[PDB]
From a paper:
Mucopolysaccharidosis type [name] (MPS [name]) is caused by the functional defect of N-sulfoglucosamine sulfohydrolase ([name]; also known as sulfamidase, sulfamate sulfohydrolase and heparan N-sulfatase; EC 3.10.1.1) and represents one of the most frequent lysosomal storage diseases worldwide. [name] belongs to the sulfatase family and catalyses the cleavage of N-linked sulfate groups from the GAGs heparan sulfate and heparin. Despite the low sequence identity between this unique N-sulfatase and the group of O-sulfatases, they share a similar overall fold and active-site architecture, including a catalytic formylglycine, a divalent metal-binding site and a sulfate-binding site.
Here, the crystal structure of glycosylated [name] is presented at 2 Å resolution. The crystal form grown at pH 7.5 is designated crystal form S (small unit cell). There are two molecules in the asymmetric unit of crystal form S and eight molecules in that of form L. The enzyme appears to exist as a homodimer in both crystal forms. The relative orientation of the dimer subunits in the L form differs from that in the S form by 2.6–3.0°, indicating that the dimer interface is slightly flexible, possibly owing to crystal packing. There are four cis-peptide bonds in both chains, between prolines and the preceding Gly127, Asp179, Ala482 and Ser492; all of them lie in good density. Difference density next to FGly70 in the active site could be modelled as a covalently bound phosphoryl group.
Author numbering:
A (entry chain A): 22 to 504
B (entry chain B): 22 to 503
């Protein structure tokens, strides 16, 4: 049988040898990249953990699958009951399904796995960060195979921050299991220490000692994640199935630094993506330039198992259709895929800053539906040494070392248009430039067509109201906003 | 031998003889008022159907029970799994529970009823608006009583709008069951027609021909609701249990007109409230001046059945405690209750305009957490003839007959302070008046203390961030908000 393994880092970026970062040591991801197609232009559709995971596992944008924000405690979003997720369709077609690590989506009836070791039924630390334990669970999973195909989803909790939840293990949990007093030992992990001066400060991160100490800790933890990818792959090799298994490696959202996680800017939505098919070796070790979305993974995995997406409606007779496509053709030839979309509504339930985006190659358009209010900041990020330092400096009147200032981080234009080929840092908004008005109209039109097609309840916001029974279906509010 | 009946109108206001509206015919609500304490100053804590129903049935504000907006389809809010609602606690203590009508809350595990006829398992029209059907189901319920006390919740769908959902029955479904072609017959209902010139136009509603035709249809439907209250009470009398039954009549939110439903203004949150205890006749037919909240119903009903509220946490070890109180002492003496709170986060999921409020007697303070954006407008209200007419006129530059203009309806101050004893229409904002600063501080403070005490996730918004492990727990964002 064909099997499939999805490896997902949490808040992972491009800190790998495979993405040309020579400061970090990620031998196992580098070895995987040599047996993979590597995508330079992959994007998540949403820069929020639960919406991202839900969109990845359904192939529907968050506005359509119902996970409008975080899933846990107080935030409490869940996808619609009638949604047919990837693991549900795979089970119905006879594929054995497993998840180890952070799930962070619900309800269980929409995202059922036959074998499930997650934060719901055990320690996130043990099933998300202790790579020895993850190794042992992957082994248990493989040893209980029954000649059905399998789909195994390994959702690492590394390299997510711990400053909010678990401060004594350090800002990225880099001290958990490192064998120092009070930390325990993860016997399969060799900790890699980084000096703050050795890290690459990305362009959107302030270059200060506090941010550098933050990145050094992240690097150690990306290291633990990389070793975990090694262990997992080694278990599939020991069980003799690796050579029958599609391996995909990605991350759910951008790194938890300014302009990253929670933004539809490039740093918040750009994701590493490796795809390794044992049946398509032609392109192993090559780099694709095609513009692809995490919305493509569900149709890629259904394609691999030859399972159709069924025609159904979640509500009324609004039939659901996937807007992503299978990546499997890209394994044989380089395609001209150019367009990716973004949709975000909430992160935390108190953070209502809906954003819609479309990218056409190096051009990116963001629409900020709630732009008159300041951009909200999540609680986990707020206590980061990086945010603290930026805030402390901004208020004390000192230089921040940052490529923006807070005021403009908080108060954004309704429309932001950027050309990354000329302006890769996305600091020159072109939506106000009359030379770019025909492009701006072309992009707004594509984004709107996608919004309708995916049944976006925010399609008419903020200037209008959706009224499905009349033509035109967006009706004006005359609320002093552009229409 | 105590039982309890809760009668809840949907979007009902003060269109009754009991509230001295002389234009409408509500004989059955009037008769009930004669055997009740009537509250002049009762308020819902939230002006949205599912949040209101959830808060009423739990005694927790919406920000604490998890029903942050509407429950149905795309909006999809549910209360937290570990919440102990009124019907759950009543069942655990041995009280048989029933619901007939519009439930509009979830999940079923948090709001379980032994006998249940709702939108979940049948037509909302039949179990919410067809009073004959409702009469027959209350009869079935009573005929199947056993050893036990009962709690029966009858949640009428009248007088809610039908313009959005069910247009062919008229703007308030006033033609459904009226015996005309295509409409069917509700044999127990006598339809009452109103001329648009006979209705009372409330102060917050434009006095125009379109709005008057809108109110005339509402009146016919308030009439059907009143007749349904009559039938329900008559079934309890026929079964011989009315005299053992606490009857409460209220509504979930203000009327679906401008400044009403979805606002924390007086018109959106003020509710009719009748309480009739067969064991406390001293104040039957009287009017209380005490300021009370629909957050008080759950503790009132638990008090009636002598059931404690248990000590539990929904999350971690943040123990839940009710902030409302029992209304039963008010049946014996007039109390000095002065303070009522309001909390709204969403209505529709696309309508994020969180509002927090506190009222101290005739003073009201509203805090609009998202004030720099325009106030959103729900889809059902937008197609009302009343909103259409106001929008069309505003757009065409014609006089609106309205006490506000749209611009100021859309763009509100962060803090709105009003004194209804001098300014009942709430059009003179006093929050910027330095003479009123000490009162403004006193009220902000009370509202903040309630927010913490009820575990409000928005307690630090919009200028700060909640960080539970540091002191102070609200941490500043320096985002140009004061
Ligand atoms: C990570 O998980 C592994 C395996 O569960 C833990 O190692 C175990 O430690 C216990 C207690 O000392 C022993 O009884 C087991 O036999 C150990 N197993 C192995 C394979 O070593 C390890 O302690 C965990 N590390 C952390 C930091 O939690
Ligand atoms: C690993 O998997 C590949 C792909 O399934 C195997 O290579 C195929 O082997 C078959 C034998 O039935 C040939 O006819 C195919 O042409 C091969 N295809 C490709 C694309 O390589 C391979 O045998 C497997 N085993 C090892 C050790 O590599
Ligand atoms: C309102 O409810 C009553 C009771 O369900 C409906 O009357 C019943 O209608 C069915 C189907 O026509 C008959 O079989 C029953 O005999 C009727 N029962 C009674 C007591 O009359 C009535 O049709 C419903 N009205 C509307 C307008 O929907
Ligand atoms: C209706 O209810 C009231 C209150 O339960 C009953 O009045 C009580 O009568 C009983 C028995 O005589 C006594 O416990 C109390 O002294 C009375 N209290 C009050 C306030 O009246 C009355 O019995 C009931 N009527 C019927 C027909 O049963
Ligand atoms: C890394 O460097 C090489 C040579 O400069 C280039 O061809 C490759 O595409 C780069 N990698 C990525 C991930 O962009
Ligand atoms: C910033 O200032 C706060 C406020 O006193 C202080 O406690 C914190 O330790 C500082 N953090 C950084 C990164 O400067
Ligand atoms: C209505 O007016 C009557 C007679 O003037 C009075 O007794 C009663 O208090 C009033 N009802 C209300 C609800 O104010
Ligand atoms: C509002 O405007 C539209 C368009 O002119 C018109 O057809 C409709 O009847 C108007 N409605 C009201 C209530 O004025
Ligand atoms: Ca994440
Ligand atoms: Ca209502
Ligand atoms: Mg009973
Ligand atoms: Mg006007």
């Amino acid at each position: 049988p064909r099997n499939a393994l999805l490896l997902l880092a949490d808040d992972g970026g491009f800190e790998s040898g495979a993405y040309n970062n020579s400061a970090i040591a990620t031998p196992h991801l580098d070895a995987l990249a040599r047996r993979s197609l590597l995508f330079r232009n992959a994007f998540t559709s949403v820069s929020s953990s639960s919406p991202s995971r839900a969109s990845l596992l359904t192939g529907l944008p968050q506005h359509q699958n119902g996970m409008y924000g975080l899933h846990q405690d107080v935030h409490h979003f869940n996808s619609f009951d009638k949604v047919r997720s990837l693991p549900l369709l795979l089970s119905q077609a006879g594929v054995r399904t497993g998840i180890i690590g952070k799930k962070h989506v619900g309800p269980e009836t929409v995202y059922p796995f036959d074998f499930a070791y997650t934060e719901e039924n055990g320690s996130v630390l043990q099933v998300g960060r202790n790579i020895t334990r993850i190794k042992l669970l992957v082994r248990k999973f493989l040893q209980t195979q029954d000649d059905r195909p399998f789909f195994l989803y390994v959702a690492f909790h590394d390299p997510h921050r711990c400053g909010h939840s678990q401060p004594q293990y350090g800002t990225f949990c880099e001290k958990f299991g490192n064998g120092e007093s009070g930390m325990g030992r993860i016997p399969d992990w060799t900790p890699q220490a980084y000096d703050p001066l050795d890290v690459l400060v990305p362009y959107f991160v302030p270059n200060t000692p506090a941010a550098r100490a933050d990145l050094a800790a992240q690097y150690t933890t990306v290291g633990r994640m990389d070793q975990g990818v090694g262990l997992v792959l080694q278990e599939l090799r020991d069980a003799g199935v690796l050579n029958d298994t599609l391996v995909i490696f990605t991350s759910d959202n951008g790194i938890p630094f300014p302009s990253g996680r929670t933004n539809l800017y490039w740093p918040g939505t750009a994701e590493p993506l490796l795809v390794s098919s044992p049946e398509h070796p032609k392109r192993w070790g090559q780099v694709s330039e095609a513009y692809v979305s995490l919305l493509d993974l569900t149709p890629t995995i259904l394609d691999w198992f030859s399972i159709p997406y069924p025609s159904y409606a979640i509500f009324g007779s609004k039939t659901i259709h996937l807007t992503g496509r299978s990546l499997l053709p890209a394994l044989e030839a380089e395609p001209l895929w150019a367009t990716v979309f973004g949709s975000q509504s909430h992160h935390e339930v108190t953070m209502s800053y809906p954003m819609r985006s479309v990218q056409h190659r190096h051009f990116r358009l963001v629409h900020n539906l709630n732009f008159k209010m300041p951009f909200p900041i999540d609680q986990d990020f707020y206590v980061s040494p990086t945010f603290q330092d930026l805030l402390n400096r901004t208020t004390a009147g000192q230089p921040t070392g940052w490529y923006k200032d807070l005021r403009h981080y908080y108060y954004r234009a309704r429309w932001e248009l950027y050309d990354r080929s000329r302006d890769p840092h996305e600091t020159q908004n072109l939506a106000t430039d009359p030379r770019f008005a025909q492009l701006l109209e072309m992009l707004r039109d594509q984004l709107a067509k996608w919004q309708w097609e995916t049944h976006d309840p925010w399609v008419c916001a903020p200037d209008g109201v959706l009224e499905e029974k009349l033509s035109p279906q967006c009706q004006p509010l005359h609320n002093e906003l552009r229409s």
